[PDB]
Every structure is written in structure tokens, then in C-alpha cells.
Ligand binder design. Structure first.
Ligand code: NA
Ligand code: NA
Ligand code: NA
Ligand code: NA
Lengths: 295, 295, 295, 295
């Protein structure tokens, strides 16, 4: 036997950081969950019990905290790039660092119409994420994403004209509910190293904002012919608005809301134009994916 | 043997309802999860295989949907009361209906600064709940609550002066993070029946709003001596603002954020006044509860 | 305002203990999650910022570990009783301790037909639990339970003869799937204190074994007329086999498996006697409860 | 813009099947969760609202059930291959089918020492899975796996000799707990189509059995130098025992059990050789991966 691939590290490293402005008294908090997995000349730790090549995962954990202490943790694309760069520069035999960061929301509270200097609310489980792959001699590959963005529209979704054969029972519709959990990823042009990532720092927050804005507005305003057609429109717009992105990926469940025929009860009309009460379905669900790039 | 207590019904009944204004085009959606459990003269279904006394749980499910079709589903205190009343009035041998409703958030989207007529976002997993116990000859007992309200403050929490003995290692502190998931319940005066519940309908949304407002403002503004002392202040205010509430209950975890001593690394100062990076602890957690009533 | 009720402590305290036999080399492990909440003369910690009455929850945590170090952690009824007794005896002003323990399974592995001395497998998420309420001047109240025991039988469940009215659509059946997650609780006679609990120690493991055995055999062998009738049979048997139990409680979901009519496709017969492929339903679910005591 | 990749279908399709032997009365059940995603000449459904190319996900669902009705659902490698083959053969413009199956355990109950003909228990959340990629003109690629196999050993794990620098605080140890959740995957040689998969049917159950056996015995018997070294031993053995497997992948968390120093309390000795009570850590966790192939 031989090792074909190997990576190892520390997962589920929860990190909080606070910034305190001594002048204004305004505090700002950041919270993330971090995974760092390393690759390199480590095969002998698997095949020959040679632990000498192991940077202990506990030390990886320590390094995450130390890096957060000595560097900005925002935008997460930058933090991840600093962190992955550290491992491949520090350790001659480590040749790649794979950094995944999940950012948790802590939105400043408004109390009596005014922003509070140190109190925050988790306004949803919606995450902002990065995957940063730092590979020695191959620069830094970053995928940014938003996930867990749960939406519903109560009309202006349609689904008709699909293939019909002996496996088909679904009725065509010109008016249905559409609800999804948005997972949207934008893949950046390869960066040559940390300096190039630093040169683009403002674009990271701005492009997350654009992606979120475009998703919400396109969902709200598209009289959707299908999930396929709506999500493509989202991806085209994001690509048009940030030339440093190479591709946009969406992964969208179709979380079904079924009509409930109640006509068996006193001839109650609850279908079609009279549909008011629905049964949300936990499973199954459609799952629609695409990756959109530049023509 | 003998049956000492028995209740049965349908749990996890997911319900959506839409309201469509034909004039304005504005749609409003509601989504809940409902449980109804019945009690009554049903012991023979357990002891003698006598299913004749069983209102099938599938029929309970049907009834939930039919009731949502024919009645407002908001405020949930009203919907629950209509639903529980139905079972005890319809079935001579059913003498209590226990209705639990979890309301899920669907907040209208703002697109380009303006409210969208039919598009919604789940802005958090925060729930608004009711427990409505409709008991024949004993009226309607309602407990209302908010849950899953996750908050953090980065300073203006303290904890000192607690008992110290041979089991104590915790250092006193005058400045710590405080984070919790708020579960807050307000218990209404008994209502004599559905008419009395109807007479108070506006108070239900208004008192949920007050409870939420009071929780957030008291959390943000109290330089907390302890979770015990802060939550008591919340409960006193809610009781002062709604005389139809008899008690207020809070159940608050203390979700710990631990300092990380990094002085072993290049003498890095990350404790006390220099504390910037923390390790959120998933477990264990403090759990603090109280029920506050009128003196 | 006034405090009507108050309890506080440490939740989600994960505990492992190992026993090592120096003679045989056989190690045995135990793993639990513990919650301890205290009551007593603590109201001033809520109303007057008086932390002097607070036994810190961090100290409660320490005490859990110290108690596990100095005492057996099995059976959990005993461990919980020792732990709760400690708090009410140690602290004059603490008058009740509420101890909840979830025991996690670590079953010894069989390797090549022989028990391994120190290797274990989690054979399911089935838990063994206790709730131990130690109340000064009122002894020790123990509820023992098993939970998360997931079972299915593919025939020899029926459901017919239930009430039929204008809300009913469910067809009567003489042959259906029955699947549930068993939550079964046995409530012990009040014990006067720790000595009495100690006097009964062997009965705790034996009665958990009986309850589990009775549940499984009654589920497997009863040609069930309803969940109500089957669970009652389980409770009667447990009461007959342990006179120190006062009541038995079951809480059983009916996790529905729906037939799928496929006759629209090439006249495929998949209902009734020809039913082979079913759709398990995640929600809704029946929920059936009863508490059985001595006649 | 242009579509670079696209796949769509139905996820979370829960399926039960029963086999009834009319002779013996012995029933056998199978339960799975299925995802099927299709690829092909479908880009116009995204770019031009052309739903004509869409095989509706609802029809995909129907097809899963119909396929389970007309074919064996075991071994899941076969079922997945039949299912994916169907889509690419039935639809000229569908060129790949990606089938993921999670198999849930339903182990026959033993009642009074004898197997019961129709009663089953979920003995753990351990899953048996397949990923079957059926690609027109490229055969059938199958990855088989077991996941959620949770184990612990209380000694005969070590970790010493790892790299030590200014980021390192972890003490070397010659005796620690090792606990993990095993995710193990074996990747089959490409099959040319369904006939070749059928030719190997017995090897699927046998190789899952070998992988499970090898995992458990190697975990129990290896005095582990590291997770890296133990998992490599597992993978080498599986490759030696099934020549139709090309690679074996393991992904193992190191679920930490921390010693608890209690010497601050009455000089209690609970570390090193005296370590009896430990604190299981929910997070962070080591994460160790490797892919082993043939030299
Ligand atoms: Na390097
Ligand atoms: Na009645
Ligand atoms: Na006391
Ligand atoms: Na094809």
C-alpha cells in the first residue's frame, strides 16, 4: 500500500474576537468556527509511526488563536489567507494549508432607535464562509460563500412545460410557493500569495454584499419559471459586478409547500385560487445546482 | 393496574397560511408547528382495546388544517384557544385539549428600500410560542413565550461576591462577556372560555412586543451583577406593563466565553484588560431560572 | 414583584469515568451528561444583587467531577442521590438539588468472539436516564428512564374501530407498520435519604433491565390494537415486576410509514396485501402518552 | 455568462421496503434515504427558461419508488446502479446520474433468545452508504462507505514524538483515551455498466463486512502511535482483502477526553496513572484523513 493523499489538522475551533475603541467606547465582536488541515511531507506519520513530521493539531489550534490575536479576523478571506500562509512558510515540509471559516452573525442591537456600543443579536443562522487553500508554489485559492439564507415567496413562482412521460404525476402550475435555503459561492481568481490578497481586501466585503443583495432582489422580483432559471440570473449578475470572480455556484433546495384539498369537508375550497392553508414538507426536496462562469 | 393520566394526539403538524389582499396585492404569510393532545374518557382505549373513544390523531391533524382555513391563525393565543375549544365542545367525552404552537419567522423583505408584497426572509430561528390548555369547566390557561433569542454583550457583565469554599476555583471578575439564548414565558390570568380570550386579542401581540423589547433593553443596559439579577429586572418590568399576566418565567443559559492565556507564546498579553481573543465554550453552561409573580 | 420559584446550576456537564482492574487488565468505562440545579434561600441573588448566596455554577461543575472521583457513578440513581445529598448537606441554605443524568452507551467490543478488555462501541443513541430530586426534609424522589429506543415492526399492528365523523379520512386497517422511539419512565417510591437509596442499589440496574426487556418483548409479540393498548400492557408488566415502583409513564410517537399507490404506473400493485415499498414520514407524527399506577 | 456545470434532482427521499416470506413468515425490512441528481443537456433550463429538458424532480422521486418496487434494494451498490442506469438509458439527453444512498439499520430483534420474524431495532445511527455515479460512456463509479461508527478505547493509545516549537503546549503522552466516529470509504474499480456490477454482487456485502471487521479489530488491538498510523493499518488490510477496491479513504475525528487536575481539592490525584474522571470535549477536535492506494 501507499498513501495517495493525506491531510490532517484541527476542526471546530471556535473563536471570538473583540475590538474596543478606547475613544468612543464602541466595541465590535466577531465569532467564527475554524478548521485548518495541512498537507505536506507527512506520509511517514501514517506508514512508519514517524510523529516527527506532525505539527500537532493542538499546536494548530494554538496557532489559530495566536494568529487571531496578532491580525485582523475580518474579512475572513484575509484572515484565512494569513493563517494558511503561516503554516506553509513556518514549516518547510508543509506544502498546503486548507482553511475553512464559518462566520457567525453578531449584529449590533438598536436600543430605543440608537446603536448600542457593546450589545449584539444573532439575527439568524445565516453564515458567511470562506474556503482558503494556500498551496506552496500555487498561490491562494479562495471560495467565498453565504449559506443558511432561508427565504420564501408566496406567489410569482411557476413550474410548467417540464417533460411528461409514464413516470410523471406532477401537475403543471402557474402559481406556487417557492422557498429555499440559499448556498451561494463565488470563486476568486487565483491569488499569487498574501500580498495579492491584501491588495484586494475591500473587495471581499463588497462582493459578499453584492451577492447577498443580488440573491434577495432576484428572488423577490423574478417571476420564476423554475429554480434553474432564477438562480442562473443571480449568478450572471454577480459575475457582471465583480470581474475578479471566475465562477458563481448555487445550491438551492426546493422546500415544498403542498396544497391541501379539504373539499371532502363541507366542500371547503382550499386549492388553486382558493389555496390558503398549506402543508410544508420536511422531505423530500428538490435540489438544484449550477456553476456559472464567463463565456 | 390503572390509568392515572393519559393524553394523545398529533405532534409536529407543520402549517402555512397565506393572506392575500386583492386590493393592494400584499400577501402576508404565517408558518407554525402545532401539537394537539387530548384528554378525556379515553382510558378504555388503553385498558380494553376500545378504539371507539379515540378521535384519530389523523383526524386531529385534519382538524388543525380545517381550523386554520376557517379562522385567523394570528395571534397564536387566539388560534390555539379556538382549536382547543373545538375539541372539548365537539366531543362530549373529551375534557381537555392541550395545544402547543411554535411560530416560525417570515419577515417581509425590503428590496431597494421598499417592502416587498410577497417575499419573506427567516430572520432567525427565534420562535414565538404558545401553550394553550383548554379544560372543560376550568376555562383556558395560556402561557406565551419567546425562545431562541440569542444575544451577546462584550462588557458590562460582572460576577463577584459569590460563595467561596473548598469547591471553588472560579476567579471573581468585574468585566466579562455575557451571552445567552433567551427563553421567556408570560402566564396569563385564567380565561373563562373563548369569549374572554377574544376580548383580549390585541393584548397578545402587544405583550409579546413588550416582553421582547424589555428583554433586549434590559440585557443591553444592565451592568449585570449576575444573570439572576438581570433576568429578575426583566420579569419585574413585564409584570408592571401588563396586569393580565400573573407570572413571568425566564430560563437563561450562561454560554461561557473563556479567556485564553497566550503569555507562554512570546509573552503575548490576552487576559484581563488585554483580553481580545476568547474561546466560546459549547458545554458545560450555567442554567439560571426563575418565576416572578406579584407581591 | 417577588420570586415565586428559582433554581440555578450547571447543565451539559460531560463526564467520563474509567475503572481499571489491576488484576485482570479489564477496564470499564462510563460516560454521562449531568445537570445539577439548586434551590434554596437564594432569592436575594435575584432581587438585591446578593451573590453571597450563590454557590457558583462553576463550583457545581467542580463538585460533579469531585463526586465522580470519590464515588461510584453507577447505577446513576445512586450517583445522582449522592450528588444531590451533598449539596443540601454541605450548604445550610440550599434546600433542594435537582440532578438529571443522561448515560451514554459504551458497550464492550467483541473481537474475534471474545470480549476486549478496553475497547467499546456506541451501540446506539439509546439513553438510560435519571431525574433525582433531593429535597431537604422530603427525602429523595427518583424517576428512572430509557429513551431513544427506536423500533419497528412490519406487521401485527392494526388500527380500526376508531371514532368516525366529518373530520375523519383515515381508512381502517388490519395490517400496518408500527415504529416508535420509546421513552419509558418508572417513578420510585419516595426514599427517605441516601441510606434508603443505598439499601436498594441492585434494584436499579435490574429494573432498567426489566423495563427494557418488557418493552421489547411486548412490542414484538403484541398484535397491537393501538399504541395505547400496547403501551399499557408494557406498563402493567413493569409494575407487576417491581413493587418499589409507584408509576410507569410511556411517551411514544407513532412514526408513520405511508403506503404508496403506484397503480398509475403500468398498473403496479403496491397497496394492501401487495404493499412492499413505503414512504416513511418525518412529520407529523402521532404522540401517545399514559401514566399507569396501582389500582 | 455560461453554465459550466449543472446537476439537479430529488434529495432526502425516504424509502422503506419489506420482503415477506410466505413460507416461513419471516419478514425483512430495508430503509434508506436516497438522493438522485442528473446531468445532461439541460443548460437551457437555466439560461432560457426551457423546462422541456427537465425530468421533474417529482418524477425522479416517483422513479425511485418504482425502481424499489421492481428491483432488489440490497446491496445498495446494486440498487444505486440500477437506478442511475435507468435515467441515462431512459432519457437520451441525460448523460449522468449521481445516486447517493444512506442505509439505516434495522436489526432483527432477539426475543427470549430467538430471532423475531417481523420486529427490528435501530442498533445505532451507524450508516452504510453508497455514492454511485453512472456516466454515459464512462461506466459506473462506486464509492461504498460506513459512517457514524462511534468507538472508544480507554488505553493503548499514545502520542509522543511530534514536532515541538514555540507554538506547542501539548504534553507528550504514553497512555491516553482514543475515541472517534469512523467514516471509511472503499472506491471500486470502474465498472463498465450494470452487467459488470451484477457480476460482483456478493462482493459488496462481503467487503462492507470486511471493512467493518478490520476497522474494529485494528482499533481494538493496535497500541496506537497516532490516529494517522492506526488508520493506515486499517486501509492496508482492506486493500489486501479485496482486489477490486482501488483506494480506501478514512476520515477520523480525534474526540478529546481531557484529564482533570483535582489536586487543588484536598490533594486529590486524578492525573497520569491516577486519572479516572475525564472531561469529554465537544470541540475542537482533531481531524485526520488519508486516501491509501496500491503501491
Ligand atoms: Na512549507
Ligand atoms: Na367535551
Ligand atoms: Na441545606
Ligand atoms: Na442518456
Amino acid at each position: 500500500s501507499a498513501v495517495k493523499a493525506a491531510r490532517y489538522g484541527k476542526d471546530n475551533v471556535r473563536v471570538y474576537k473583540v475590538h474596543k475603541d478606547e475613544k468612543t467606547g464602541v466595541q465590535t465582536v466577531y465569532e467564527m468556527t475554524v478548521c485548518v488541515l495541512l498537507e505536506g511531507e507527512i506520509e511517514t506519520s501514517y506508514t512508519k509511526a514517524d510523529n516527527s513530521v506532525i505539527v500537532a493539531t493542538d499546536s494548530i489550534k494554538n496557532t489559530i488563536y495566536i494568529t487571531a490575536k496578532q491580525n485582523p479576523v475580518t474579512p475572513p478571506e484575509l484572515f484565512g489567507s494569513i493563517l494558511g500562509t503561516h503554516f506553509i512558510e513556518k514549516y518547510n515540509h508543509i506544502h498546503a494549508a486548507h482553511v475553512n471559516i464559518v462566520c457567525h452573525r453578531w449584529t449590533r442591537m438598536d436600543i430605543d432607535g440608537k446603536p448600542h456600543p457593546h450589545s449584539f443579536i444573532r439575527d439568524s443562522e445565516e453564515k458567511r464562509n470562506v474556503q482558503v487553500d494556500v498551496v506552496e508554489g500555487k498561490g491562494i485559492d479562495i471560495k467565498s460563500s453565504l449559506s443558511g439564507l432561508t427565504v420564501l415567496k408566496s406567489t410569482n413562482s411557476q413550474f410548467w412545460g417540464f417533460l411528461r412521460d409514464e413516470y410523471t404525476t406532477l401537475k403543471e402550475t402557474w402559481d406556487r410557493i417557492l422557498s429555499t435555503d440559499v448556498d451561494a459561492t463565488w470563486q476568486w481568481k487565483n491569488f499569487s500569495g498574501l500580498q495579492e490578497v491584501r491588495s484586494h481586501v475591500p473587495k471581499f466585503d463588497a462582493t459578499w454584499a453584492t451577492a447577498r443583495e443580488v440573491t434577495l432582489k432576484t428572488f423577490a422580483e423574478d417571476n420564476s419559471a423554475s429554480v434553474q432559471a432564477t438562480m442562473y440570473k443571480m449568478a450572471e449578475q454577480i459575475l457582471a459586478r465583480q470581474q475578479l470572480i471566475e465562477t458563481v455556484e448555487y445550491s438551492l433546495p426546493n422546500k415544498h409547500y403542498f396544497e391541501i384539498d379539504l373539499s371532502w369537508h363541507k366542500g371547503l375550497q382550499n386549492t388553486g385560487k382558493n389555496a390558503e392553508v398549506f402543508a410544508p414538507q420536511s422531505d423530500p426536496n428538490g435540489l438544484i445546482k449550477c456553476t456559472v462562469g464567463r463565456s
